[PDB]
Amino acid sequence: CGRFFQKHQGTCFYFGELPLSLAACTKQWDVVTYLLENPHQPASLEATDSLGNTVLHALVMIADNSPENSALVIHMYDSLLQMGARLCPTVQLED
Amino acid sequence: CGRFFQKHQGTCFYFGELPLSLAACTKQWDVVTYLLENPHQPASLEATDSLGNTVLHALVMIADNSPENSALVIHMYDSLLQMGARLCPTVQLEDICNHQGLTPLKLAAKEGKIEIFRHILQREFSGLYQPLSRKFTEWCYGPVRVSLYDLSSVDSWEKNSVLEIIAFHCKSPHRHRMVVLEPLNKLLQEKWDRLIPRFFFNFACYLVYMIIFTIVAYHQPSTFGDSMLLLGHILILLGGIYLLLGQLWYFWRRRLFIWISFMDSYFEILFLVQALLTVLSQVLRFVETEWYLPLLVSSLVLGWLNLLYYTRGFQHTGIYSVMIQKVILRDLLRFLLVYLVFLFGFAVALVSLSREARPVPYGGILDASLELFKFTIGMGELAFQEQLRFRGVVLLLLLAYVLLTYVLLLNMLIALMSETVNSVATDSWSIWKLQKAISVLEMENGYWWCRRKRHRAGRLLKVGTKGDGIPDERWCFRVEEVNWAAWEKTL
Amino acid sequence: QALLTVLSQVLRFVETEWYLPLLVSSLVLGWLNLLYYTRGFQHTGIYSVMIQKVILRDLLRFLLVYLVFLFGFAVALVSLSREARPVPYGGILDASLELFKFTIGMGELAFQEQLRFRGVVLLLLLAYVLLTYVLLLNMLIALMSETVNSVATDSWSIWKLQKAIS
Ligand SMILES: CC(C)CCC[C@@H](C)[C@H]1CC[C@H]2[C@@H]3CC=C4C[C@@H](O)CC[C@]4(C)[C@H]3CC[C@]12C
Ligand SMILES: CC(C)CCC[C@@H](C)[C@H]1CC[C@H]2[C@@H]3CC=C4C[C@@H](O)CC[C@]4(C)[C@H]3CC[C@]12C
């Protein structure tokens, strides 16, 4: 929760201020997985930041109306939804 | 140094009149090298010709705005710069002064070559040639990147900068496209945002001056009121002399500009004329003449018309003003020529007849001309006058004039205005940006009585290390961009 | 419109001298607002959207330039033409109205001879005519043409959004 990582005008980049959301927002589909089957301390997927935003909220924040960013956001959204299907079936992330 | 190898009009080809420059200009990247490692007599790379032009100047002169020549010039420029890095590291080729006092960047700016100018303005290298770069890329945290553009010889703080060259020296047909590109864009926007208060303060001062002018002109004859009127008269005199002095200082310190570009400013002339008329009328009231009020009201009209100078400053209205200028210059003068020819012919014809009785209409040339011009404003009389012996000839002539001038010519003028507006809808924005750049460059200076304190643009950063000593630090301009395309191509 | 109507109705009990102006202003505003229901049909709703776009895009700046020109020329004509060799161009409002008559194709352009500066008046009037009626209004027509050609595709979506709001 630093001035650079919040949503404002100027020097900023909001990614959800969470390591899982940070990895998801950077098209790093190798470490996002590893945060989910690390046997020692698993990373919760329904975890929210100080702004009340979860990983999907962070993804939809960073979405621009560009052909190259929209594809990234869509693919990460779909893949992470399928990933969360196998981890937390009793709770739905869309709500 | 022969007539064929100099820069003139006709049969000529200027290549720098030097064997090294000749080889470089012909895409001969086999012999240009050989001139540099021949053991017997090496060829100096900082060698200049009789025109004060080095090899880099020769390269930039032969540059045309063509996709096939621009690539050649750019590649030779970059390759020769890298080659000279390994031969002469203690000297910098980019800062070789011409006989006219120009550098390759400044020479590109003045000659209007836009492709090589843009490439030189932002060029980046990968490895050993970091110092030979203008645009640097600092920390790429995620998809946001900060670009530092070199502000050497392009920031207006220097005496002869690139911004001033484009504004006041470039004679190119389209020099408004060189003012909107990268690190020539953002810098001007920042300067305008910082100079807005001064611009609107000048606007307010001029508005107050014309309010005083209108009050004085409206309340003059053919006490407290008399004292206020005298104060207004003297205030107008000093205001007019101030405007005249400012315009004279402008034309003194910018004497050439009237020949490089008449069409681009065209308000300094109007301000000068208005100030001249005002001061002349004020010094003409002491003569107690009869031609005072005409010139006074002419200056009153001209100033209120010139008030549209400050219409610039807003995109919506500035682009409208630019389009107004384009419409006036493009499809109004020839219409006026044809209209005056038709009007004069028909007016003379109507005056020639209609004096043979079977006051009098169409008595003279001016009367008939006015009666015919009334048709344009939808007020022409088209009666069947019966006092004349040739009523039918008059009616037929009037009908011919009406169908030939009011139905055809004015509607065709409307169509021409429509197509002109559709044609110049994209360059007007660049023209407005160039006008803003000129206004900013003028406002950076002070006045003819007080020179403003100059302000550095750009921050000092940490660029890198030179190959001679240690730190080689330069003033840079920082710009952030949220770009995902570049971030895709770095995984 | 509702505020004007209720205020005028509560102003009739006071027997106020300014009842009829507000009453007729509300009468105009209601009939103008009747074009709210013009939307509801595609052909007329898109026309209303285009009318709004034209008003917002290329009518206000024309009005600014026109008022600047009109004020300058009206003040100029009022300043002179009071030197005899009623009286035309007696005041600012009279001269402004006479100059605005040119726009609606009703301006008088005679060579008045009672004035000492008839030539200056005629030249000024001609300059105003060529600078405002030949150039500016035709350029307005051209600007509306290009604006209509520019917004011919988004107006349908704007009308759909208006229907969604309704
Ligand atoms: C120069 C002296 C003799 C006056 C005659 C020229 C004046 C009256 C005419 C000639 C060309 C005209 C100008 C042409 C271009 C522009 C720019 C536009 O954005 C506003 C109108 C404006 C400013 C016109 C105002 C009237 C104008 C200045
Ligand atoms: C607001 C009070 C003071 C009245 C002044 C504003 C009125 C008279 C003017 C200003 C803007 C104008 C409106 C601009 C837009 C539209 C939408 C169009 O589809 C029909 C005409 C209509 C409805 C115009 C009617 C007249 C109008 C409403």
Q: What is the 3-state secondary structure (H, E, C) of chain B?
A: CCCCCCCCCCCCCCCCCCHHHHHHHCCCCCHHHHHHHCCCCCCCCCCCCCCCCCHHHHHHHCCCCCHHHHHHHHHHHHHHHHHHHHHCCCCCHHHCCCCCCCCHHHHHHHHCCHHHHHHHHCCCCCCCCCCCCCEEECCCCCCEEEEEEECCCCCCCCCCCHHHHHHHCCCCCCCCCCCCCCCCCHHHHHHHHHHHHHHHHHHHHHHHHHHHHHHHHHCCCCCHHHHHHHHHHHHHHHHHHHHHHHHHHHHHHCCCHHHHCCCCCCCHHHHHHHHHHHHHHHHHCCCCCCCHHHHHHHHHHHHHHHHHHCCCCCHHHHHHHHHHHHHHHHHCHHHHHHHHHHHHHHHHHHHHCCCCECCCCCCCHHHHHHHHHCCCCCCCCCCCCCCECCHHHHHHHHHHHHHHHHHCHHHHHHHHHHHHHHHCCCHHHHHHHHHHHHHHHHHHCCCCCCCCCCCCCCEECCCCECCCCCECCCEEEEEEEECCHHHHCCC
Distance of CA B377 from the midpoint of ligand 1 (Å): 21
Count interface pairs A-B at CB distance under 8 A.
18
List all residues 6 or more positions away from C155 whose beta carbon is below 8 Å from its beta carbon.
C46, C49, C50, C53
- Which residue shows structure tokens 């100080």? A50
Which residue has the CA at smallest separation from atom 1 of ligand 1?
B270
Ligand nearest to the CA of C34: 2
Residues from chain B that touch A66, judged by Cβ atoms under 8 A, are: 484
Report the alpha-carbon distance of residue C47 to residue C159 in Å, rounded.
10
Please answer whether residues B257 and B265 qualify as being in contact, where contact means their C-beta atoms are separated by less than 8 angstroms. yes
Report the alpha-carbon distance of residue B249 to residue B245 in Å, rounded.
6
Burial of B229 (0-12, 13-18, 19+ CB in 10 A): middle
How is the beta sheet containing B475-482 ordered, strand by strand?
Answer: B135-137, B144-150, B475-482, B459-460
3-state SS record for A6-75: CCCCCCCCCCCCCHHHHHHHCCCCCHHHHCCCCCCCCCCCCCCCCCCCCHHHHHHHCCCCCHHHHHHHHH
Please answer whether residues B36 and B78 qualify as being in contact, where contact means their C-beta atoms are separated by less than 8 angstroms. no
Check contact C-A (3+ Cβ pairs < 8 Å).
no
Please answer whether residues B480 and A11 qualify as being in contact, where contact means their C-beta atoms are separated by less than 8 angstroms. yes
Long-range own/partner contacts, residues C38-43 (CB < 8 A, 24 or more apart): C39/C159, C39/C162, C39/C163, C39/C166, C40/C163, C40/C166, C42/C156, C42/C159
From the CB of C63, is ligand 2 less than 6 Å away? no
Q: C66 touching B, CB under 8 A?
A: no
Report the alpha-carbon distance of residue B109 to residue A85 in Å, rounded.
60
Tokens in use for B333? Answer: 């003068």
The H or E element spanning position C13 is none
Closest Cα partner for B467 from B131, B147, B21? B131
Taking an 8 Å cut-off on Cβ atoms, the answer to whether B418 and C145 are in contact is yes
Ligand nearest to the CA of C155: 2
Is the alpha carbon torsion for B93, B98, B104, B106 positive or negative?
A: positive
What's the angle, vertex CA A76, arms to CA A71 and CA A78, rounded to 5?
A: 95
Measured in degrees and rounded to the nearest 5, phi and psi for residue B149 equal -95, 135
Report the alpha-carbon distance of residue A95 to residue B187 in Å, rounded.
46
Note the residue count of chain A. 95
Among C49, C51, C58, C60, say which to mutate for ligand 2: greatest number of ligand atoms within 8 Å of CB.
C51
CB environment B445-457: b (16+ within 10 A), e (fewer) = eeeeeeeeeeeeb
Measured in degrees and rounded to the nearest 5, phi and psi for residue B477 equal -115, 125
Please answer whether residues C54 and C147 qualify as being in contact, where contact means their C-beta atoms are separated by less than 8 angstroms. yes
- Which residue shows structure tokens 């009518």? C59
Please answer whether residues B111 and B60 qualify as being in contact, where contact means their C-beta atoms are separated by less than 8 angstroms. yes
Other Cβ atoms within 10 Å of B423 Cβ, number: 11
Report the alpha-carbon distance of residue A32 to residue A29 in Å, rounded.
6
Please answer whether residues B10 and B19 qualify as being in contact, where contact means their C-beta atoms are separated by less than 8 angstroms. no
CB environment C97-130: b (16+ within 10 A), e (fewer) = ebbeebeeeebebeebeebbbeebbbebbeebbe
Please tell me the experimental approach by which this structure was elucidated. Answer: cryo-EM
List all residues 6 or more positions away from B49 whose beta carbon is below 8 Å from its beta carbon.
B1, B16, B17, B18, B21, B58
Report the alpha-carbon distance of residue B20 to residue C59 in Å, rounded.
62
Closest Cα partner for B134 from B120, B155, B114, B146? B120
Tokens in use for C118? Answer: 């008839």
Three-state DSSP state, C18: coil
CB environment B348-386: b (16+ within 10 A), e (fewer) = ebbbeebeeeeeeebeeeebbbbbbbbbbbebeeeeeee
Which candidate from A13, A69, A72 shows the least CB-CB separation from B141? A13
Taking an 8 Å cut-off on Cβ atoms, the answer to whether B304 and C102 are in contact is no
Report the alpha-carbon distance of residue B237 to residue B193 in Å, rounded.
34
Report the alpha-carbon distance of residue B44 to residue A33 in Å, rounded.
61
Which candidate from B141, B480, B488 shows the least CB-CB separation from A68? B488
Note the residue count of chain B. 491
Q: B234 touching A, CB under 8 A?
A: no
Report the alpha-carbon distance of residue B456 to residue B158 in Å, rounded.
9
Report the alpha-carbon distance of residue C54 to residue A80 in Å, rounded.
47
Please answer whether residues C101 and C107 qualify as being in contact, where contact means their C-beta atoms are separated by less than 8 angstroms. yes
Report the alpha-carbon distance of residue A60 to residue C12 in Å, rounded.
59
Three-state DSSP state, C36: helix
Distances (CA, A) of B413 to B327, B339, B347: 11, 11, 22
Tokens in use for A70? Answer: 């929209």
Tokens in use for B227? Answer: 């004292």
Tokens in use for A30? Answer: 């190798």
Report the alpha-carbon distance of residue A72 to residue A93 in Å, rounded.
19
Taking an 8 Å cut-off on Cβ atoms, the answer to whether B141 and A72 are in contact is no
Within 13 Å, how many C-alpha atoms sit on residue B84's CB side?
22
Three-state DSSP state, C115: strand
Which candidate from B297, B379, B420 shows the least CB-CB separation from C80? B297
Phi-psi region of B205 (alpha: psi -120 to 50; beta: other; left: phi over 0): alpha
Which candidate from A13, A68, A69 shows the least CB-CB separation from B142? A13
In angstroms, what separates the C-alpha of C87 from chain B's closest C-alpha? 15
Report the alpha-carbon distance of residue B178 to residue B192 in Å, rounded.
17
B417, B422, B426, B430 alpha-carbon torsion, rounded to 10°: 0
Report the alpha-carbon distance of residue B246 to residue B209 in Å, rounded.
15
- Which residue shows structure tokens 């020329």? C73
Closest Cα partner for B7 from B53, B74, B73? B53
Q: B325 touching C, CB under 8 A?
A: no
Please answer whether residues C63 and C129 qualify as being in contact, where contact means their C-beta atoms are separated by less than 8 angstroms. no
Tokens in use for B220? Answer: 């003059």
Taking an 8 Å cut-off on Cβ atoms, the answer to whether C141 and B418 are in contact is yes
Report the alpha-carbon distance of residue A51 to residue B344 in Å, rounded.
78
From the CB of B298, is ligand 1 less than 6 Å away? no
Is the alpha carbon torsion for B68, B69, B75, B78 positive or negative?
A: negative
Taking an 8 Å cut-off on Cβ atoms, the answer to whether A25 and B141 are in contact is no
The H or E element spanning position C121 is helix C118-129
Report the alpha-carbon distance of residue A20 to residue B190 in Å, rounded.
38
Distance of CA B336 from the midpoint of ligand 2 (Å): 37
Which residue has the CA at smallest separation from atom 19 of ligand 2?
C48
Please answer whether residues B139 and B463 qualify as being in contact, where contact means their C-beta atoms are separated by less than 8 angstroms. no
Which ligand 2 atom is at minimum distance from the Cα of C28? 8
Parallel, antiparallel, or unpaired: how do β-strands B459-460 and B144-150 relate? unpaired
| Partners of residue B482 on adjacent β-strands | B144
Closest Cα partner for B322 from C118, C61, A42? C61
Distances (CA, A) of C134 to B134, B333, B425, C102: 52, 12, 21, 11
What's the angle, vertex CA B106, arms to CA B102 and CA B110, rounded to 5?
A: 100
List all residues 6 or more positions away from B455 whose beta carbon is below 8 Å from its beta carbon.
B157, B194, B444
Report the alpha-carbon distance of residue A72 to residue A82 in Å, rounded.
16
3-state SS record for C65-90: HHHHHHHHHHHHHHHCCCCECCCCCC
Residues from chain A that touch B485, judged by Cβ atoms under 8 A, are: 68
Give chain A's radius of gyration (CA, Å). Answer: 13
Tokens in use for B341? Answer: 């020819």
Within 13 Å, how many C-alpha atoms sit on residue B154's CB side?
27
